């Protein structure tokens, strides 16, 4: 009868644990997980704290419209073999310093472009969308205006620049700086679109350190990602 | 530098055996422990706790 009694104990303990997992599954399904990745001196440090402290390894919590998000940094690895553990995230945030093209001596942008190309074509990340951030706006503008350094010498394809049609410059901006920015934007979007396959996309944005609207930008982009995934699920897009 | 050379010298001077003896030993062990393995040799349903 002791044997019967022990079987009774196991059933009651499975009974609590089974109940506990069910409560846990709902929370894990509620939240969305993001990965923060960028090159050195890009400004990831500025983005993780300057944006979240007012809005309210390194795991960061922030709340937008009562929707849970969870952001993982990457601590402070020329090879990358731990990236296979991040194939189930909602989106991958890429932060690259726009102002550092002349600074070096492979142009640092070129290294960032190579990293983005390698990440895009990874076998395990075939269906992960990338949100791209361009920091150092004011430094780039100051370098372009009355700047001894020339884009053409470092990047020889700039000789043909035509601001892309549907150009939407902000108010009171010189044409030269916009023609410079859209060149880099198109350079990244070329790599994005070469092998898009319609499963994942890249969203170009322009930003600086001061602005705090980026937290809403991430929310809107995540909403768009889920909407597009659902639309492709039912053979409508 | 020199420590690497010393370590390489230590690893180089190691006794070896003919591969035939090692193959024979492995085959002898495999033949000796053939009966015990249930995966290799089927076992009765009574003796299987997974049925």
């Amino acid at each position: 009868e002791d044997q019967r009694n022990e079987e009774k104990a196991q059933r009651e303990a499975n009974k609590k644990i089974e109940k506990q997992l069910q409560k846990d599954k709902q929370v894990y399904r509620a939240t969305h997980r993001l990965l923060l990745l960028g090159a050195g001196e890009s400004g990831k440090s500025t983005i993780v704290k300057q944006m979240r402290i007012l809005h309210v390894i390194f795991e960061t919590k922030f709340q937008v419209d009562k929707v849970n998000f969870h952001m993982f940094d990457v601590g402070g690895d020329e090879r990358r073999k731990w990236i296979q553990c991040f194939n189930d995230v909602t989106a991958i945030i890429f932060v690259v310093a726009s102002s550092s093209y002349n600074m070096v001596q492979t142009n640092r942008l070129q290294e960032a472009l190579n990293l983005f190309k390698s990440i895009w074509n990874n076998r395990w990340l075939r269906t992960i969308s990338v949100i791209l951030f361009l920091n150092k706006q004011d430094l780039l503008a100051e370098k372009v205006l009355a700047g001894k350094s020339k884009i053409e010498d470092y990047f020889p394809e700039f000789a043909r620049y035509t601001t892309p049609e549907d150009a939407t410059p902000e108010p009171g901006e010189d044409p030269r700086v916009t023609r410079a920015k859209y060149f880099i934007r198109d350079e990244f979007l070329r790599i994005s679109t070469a092998s898009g396959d319609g499963r994942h996309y890249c969203y170009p944005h322009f930003t600086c350190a001061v602005d705090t609207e980026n937290i809403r930008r991430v929310f809107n982009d995540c909403r768009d990602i889920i909407q597009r995934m659902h639309l492709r699920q039912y053979e409508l897009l | 530098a020199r420590k690497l050379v010393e370590q390489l010298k230590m690893e180089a001077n190691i006794d070896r055996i003919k591969v035939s003896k090692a193959a024979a030993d492995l085959m002898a062990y495999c033949e000796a422990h053939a009966k015990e393995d249930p995966l290799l040799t089927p076992v009765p349903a009574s003796e299987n706790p997974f049925r």
Binding site: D24, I57 | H33, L40
Partner: protein
């Protein structure tokens, strides 16, 4: 300097004249008249569910009754194989984990991941929720595997090309092993707990001595990363699996590989390698959503172990050789006999 380099070349030159002469006749010729084991069929016996996400590792207990597994939701669950009833659910401070281990005494369980900390839990605590006892730190890279050498000391291999032998009572590195160039991924202990091997990421395997602190030999048969390693029950062999879908069996005494397993119909990777009690059967996982069973002496498939919808990343064979368990990214654990 350069003269020292010439001195190293002098030393390197002797080994080839030795390994070439030692190779009399390969095992393939020697093992030719032994009859094949024939077709072996295996069917699922139990199915375990309850994990909310993919599974990375598992380790059978010493009684062939209990096992422990870890997922990416931050939860270790200890099961009961016969009754298929869970026993414990251990929350984790973090979420991403890459390894797990079970004590020979069955009262400690270890688990570490991307963070540079290896933790130890106390299962046999009276009237208490199982709780963290020690937190081992000192590594600069992500951990990959860890095994209990004893009840008081653990050996761990990290991603910064280093290995260490810890002490639970104090929490400091007693001996540190260096010499690898790529990240060390997996290791296995000898039955007598006298030596342990490790296959790194630079297509190289090494044999270490626990007591002395230095590497006795080194094998470089493979060409790509090594993702798993096992160790022969006799203690004079070990097999490694590499990304190029090739399994190789080496030898400690002969100091070179004896037989390689490959097929032209597979181009996927490998994630786990395990032997059997008799050593006759070699079980290897794949990325082709299934498992395989090889022959140690014939290099011929003897069956197919399929049924998983996602990739296989774990494997284990019981001490008594009663059953084999496979884990997959499909959040399902399966026990086959």
């Amino acid at each position: 300097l350069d003269q020292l380099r010439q001195e190293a070349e002098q030393l390197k030159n002797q080994i080839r004249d030795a390994r070439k002469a030692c190779a009399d006749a390969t095992l393939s010729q020697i093992t030719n008249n032994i009859d094949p084991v024939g077709r072996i069929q295996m069917r699922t016996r139990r199915t375990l569910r309850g994990h909310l996400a993919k599974i990375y590792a598992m380790h059978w207990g010493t009684d062939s009754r209990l096992l422990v597994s870890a997922s990416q939701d931050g939860k270790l669950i200890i099961w009961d194989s016969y009754t298929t009833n869970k026993v414990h659910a251990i929350p984790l401070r973090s979420s991403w984990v890459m390894t797990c281990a079970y004590a020979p005494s069955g009262n400690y369980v270890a688990c570490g991941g991307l963070d540079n900390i290896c933790s130890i839990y106390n299962l046999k605590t009276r009237e208490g929720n199982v709780r963290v006892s020690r937190e081992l730190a000192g590594h600069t890279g992500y951990l990959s595997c860890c095994r209990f050498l004893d009840d008081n000391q653990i050996v761990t291999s990290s991603g910064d090309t280093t290995c260490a032998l810890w002490d639970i009572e104090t929490g400091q590195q007693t001996t540190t092993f260096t010499g690898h160039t790529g990240d060390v991924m997996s290791l296995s202990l000898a039955p007598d707990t006298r030596l342990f091997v490790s296959g790194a990421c630079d297509a190289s395997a090494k044999l270490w001595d626990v007591r002395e602190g230095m590497c006795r030999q080194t094998f470089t048969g493979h060409e790509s990363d090594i993702n798993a390693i096992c160790f022969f029950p006799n203690g004079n062999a070990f097999a490694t699996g590499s990304d190029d879908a090739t399994c190789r069996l080496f030898d400690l005494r002969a100091d070179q590989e004896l037989m390689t397993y490959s097929h032209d119909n597979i181009i996927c990777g490998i994630t786990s390698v395990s032997f059997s009690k008799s050593g006759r059967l070699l079980l290897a996982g794949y990325d082709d959503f299934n498992c395989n069973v090889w022959d140690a002496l014939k290099a011929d498939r003897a069956g197919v172990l399929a049924g998983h919808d996602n990739r296989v990343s774990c494997l284990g064979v019981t001490d008594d050789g009663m059953a084999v368990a496979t884990g997959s990214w499909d959040s399902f654990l399966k026990i086959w006999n």
